[PDB]
Amino acid sequence: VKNPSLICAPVMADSIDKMVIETSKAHELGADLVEIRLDWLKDFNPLEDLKTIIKKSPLPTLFTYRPKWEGGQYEGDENERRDVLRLAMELGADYIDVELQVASEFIKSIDGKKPGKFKVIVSSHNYQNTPSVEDLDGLVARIQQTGADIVKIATTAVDIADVARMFHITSKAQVPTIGLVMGERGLMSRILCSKFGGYLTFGTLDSSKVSAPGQPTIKDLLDLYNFRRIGPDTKVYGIIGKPVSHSKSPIVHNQAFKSVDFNGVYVHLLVDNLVSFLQAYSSSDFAGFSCTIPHKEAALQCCDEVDPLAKSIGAVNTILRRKSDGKLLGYNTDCIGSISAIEDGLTVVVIGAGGAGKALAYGAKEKGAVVIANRTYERALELAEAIGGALSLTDLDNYEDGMVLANTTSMGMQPNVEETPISKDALKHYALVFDAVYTPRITRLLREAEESGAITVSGSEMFVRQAYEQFEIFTGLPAPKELYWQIMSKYGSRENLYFQ
Numbered sequence: 001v002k003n004p005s006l007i008c009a010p011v012m013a014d015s016i017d018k019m020v021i022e023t024s025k026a027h028e029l030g031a032d033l034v035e036i037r038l039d040w041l042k043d044f045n046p047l048e049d050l051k052t053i054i055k056k057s058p059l060p061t062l063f064t065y066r067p068k069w070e071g072g073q074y075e076g077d078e079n080e081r082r083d084v085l086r087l088a089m090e091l092g093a094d095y096i097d098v099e100l101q102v103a104s105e106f107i108k109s110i111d112g113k114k115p116g117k118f119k120v121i122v123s124s125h126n127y128q129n130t131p132s133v134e135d136l137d138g139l140v141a142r143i144q145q146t147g148a149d150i151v152k153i154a155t156t157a158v159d160i161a162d163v164a165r166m167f168h169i170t171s172k173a174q175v176p177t178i179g180l181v182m183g184e185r186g187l188m189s190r191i192l193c194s195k196f197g198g199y200l201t202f203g204t205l206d207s208s209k210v211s212a213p214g215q216p217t218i219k220d221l222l223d224l225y226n227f228r229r230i231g232p233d234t235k236v237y238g239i240i241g242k243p244v245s246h247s248k249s250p251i252v253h254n255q256a257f258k259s260v261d262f263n264g265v266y267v268h269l270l271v272d273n274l275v276s277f278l279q280a281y282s283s284s285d286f287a288g289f290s291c292t293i294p295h296k297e298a299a300l301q302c303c304d305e306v307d308p309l310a311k312s313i314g315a316v317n318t319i320l321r322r323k324s325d326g327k328l329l330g331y332n333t334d335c336i337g338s339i340s341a342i343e344d345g346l347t348v349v350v351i352g353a354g355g356a357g358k359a360l361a362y363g364a365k366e367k368g369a370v371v372i373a374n375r376t377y378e379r380a381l382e383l384a385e386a387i388g389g390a391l392s393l394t395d396l397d398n399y400e401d402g403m404v405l406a407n408t409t410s411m412g413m414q415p416n417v418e419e420t421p422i423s424k425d426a427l428k429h430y431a432l433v434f435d436a437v438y439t440p441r442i443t444r445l446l447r448e449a450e451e452s453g454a455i456t457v458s459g460s461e462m463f464v465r466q467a468y469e470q471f472e473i474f475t476g477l478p479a480p481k482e483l484y485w486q487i488m489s490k491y492g493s494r495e496n497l498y499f500q
């Protein structure tokens with residue numbers, strides 16, 4: 001509905017002087033407005049303090065004095081609380097957020113007293129779930145009926161499929177609407193506002209100044225997700241996984257899309273049930289997906305058509321939605337990525353028999369030489385016979401001297417930084433050691449291997465390679481290889497990052 005979504009920065013410092021400094025930082029960062037959370041102020045002298053904030057703030061102001069009964073911090077007289085909000089309006093506030101429960105009474109009290117450049121936001125918070133479209137419509141209607149200028153609804157995501165309902169509300173409600181879904185599983189609702197008609201989204205000054213679960217930083221909205229470039233026609237892509245917060249796919253693909261001016265946006269997709277997810281987002285708005293742990297196998301089954309390579313491997317890490325009919329096509333870029341990465345580094349001992357293990361095993365055979373060691377023996381066995389090559393995860397420790405080791409399990413992946421699939425005593429037997437885990441870049445395994453005298457190949461080499469191949473599949477444009485290497489070096493080098 002109407003204009004692109006604004007970016008509002010929550011201001012919660014416990015003193016007036018600190019809030020003033022925060023409004024300045026919000027400006028520096030690129031926010032469009034700030035939400036002053038008055039209920040977080042330790043000491044508060046209404047007239048004096050409100051006067052100061054309004055005078056010194058470089059950005060439009062939105063005042064909120066949230067009470068404990070609506071998830072806020074304020075306790076005490078209700079009339080006093082309301083007097084403060086009215087006082088804010090009188091002094092020049094650009095907006096005030098008033099709770100639905102008392103919005104009727106409030107809006108009546110200011111009838112014919114509203115300044116020219118002043119709008120009243122009426123909000124509702126649901127800390128349990130995201131109601132049906134039927135119930136959301138009734139909520140919108142109730143809020144409109146109070147005389148609100150802007151409708152604000154915040155729900156909670158029990159499952160990622162819940163977000164689709166909020167997009168329907170922001171996209172079709174004929175009234176300015178701020179619609180957000182809280183929780184990691186609802187993050188997408190905070191990023192794609194400009195495509196689905198949302199009036200505003202909240203971005204934080206920093207990762208520690210969060211006012212509600214799931215809020216991203218202003219910096220990431222602008223520079224990582226390319227917020228300003230998102231519009232009604234932008235195609236949506238994402239990394240499907242569980243967990244998925246460690247993924248850097250959104251960093252590299254959004255940079256690349258921007259560089260070649262491709263109208264697309266890439267986000268994190270925390271998925272519990274793959275089947276329900278694909279069914280919930282089958283529209284042409286969702287054009288493609290990357291798939292990581294542990295949905296690579298399930299992805300294969302959900303595809304209408306599977307590339308010969310993906311089929312022989314038994315796993316899919318790339319899904320494309322054909323604009324023609326609207327069916328899903330499956331591909332596998334993991335094989336080429338891992339094999340090419342290893343060869344460049346130079347009997348392959350593959351640790352793990354899941355999606356990545358299957359691809360690396362297959363490809364290793366295609367090149368000539370393969371042993372599969374897995375926690376769950378049966379899987380390693382099944383795989384070994386599938387490509388003519390099994391080893392018990394325990395026998396791997398005491399298992400030639402110029403062999404190559406390739407870990408494809410999630411052992412060592414953040415935050416399990418001290419896990420390693422094998423004893424460093426067996427490393428001296430390998431010439432090269434590869435690790436698919438790329439977060440962190442240097443796992444305990446690669447570290448002890450480097451100390452074992454062997455040559456190492458980090459998962460980042462495999463990551464960039466499989467990623468530029470996905471770009472080509474998604475956009476139909478030649479893989480900009482050199483570009484992806486540059487993007488990863490410049491923007492994807494920081495460790496311990498979680499997007500949630």
Ligand SMILES: NC(=O)c1ccc[n+]([C@@H]2O[C@H](COP(=O)([O-])OP(=O)(O)OC[C@H]3O[C@H](n4cnc5c(N)ncnc54)[C@H](OP(=O)(O)O)[C@@H]3O)[C@@H](O)[C@H]2O)c1
Binds near residue numbers: 353408436
């Ligand atoms: N950088 C890249 O390009 C790239 C590409 C692909 C995958 N990866 C990484 O490699 C990992 C696996 O992805 P995936 O799709 O193949 O997941 P799967 O879920 O497809 O593979 C998971 C594997 O690790 C599991 N596992 C969990 N804890 C284990 C433990 N403590 N000891 C032994 N195995 C354990 C499974 O063991 P069981 O079979 O016994 O259950 C299994 O072999 C992820 O961390 C991912 O980030 C990186």
Ligand SMILES: O=C(O)C1C=C(O)[C@@H](O)[C@H](O)C1
Binds near residue numbers: 247250317466
């Ligand atoms: O974003 C990630 O972590 C990814 C990880 C691997 O599983 C790739 O196969 C995916 O395509 C992307």
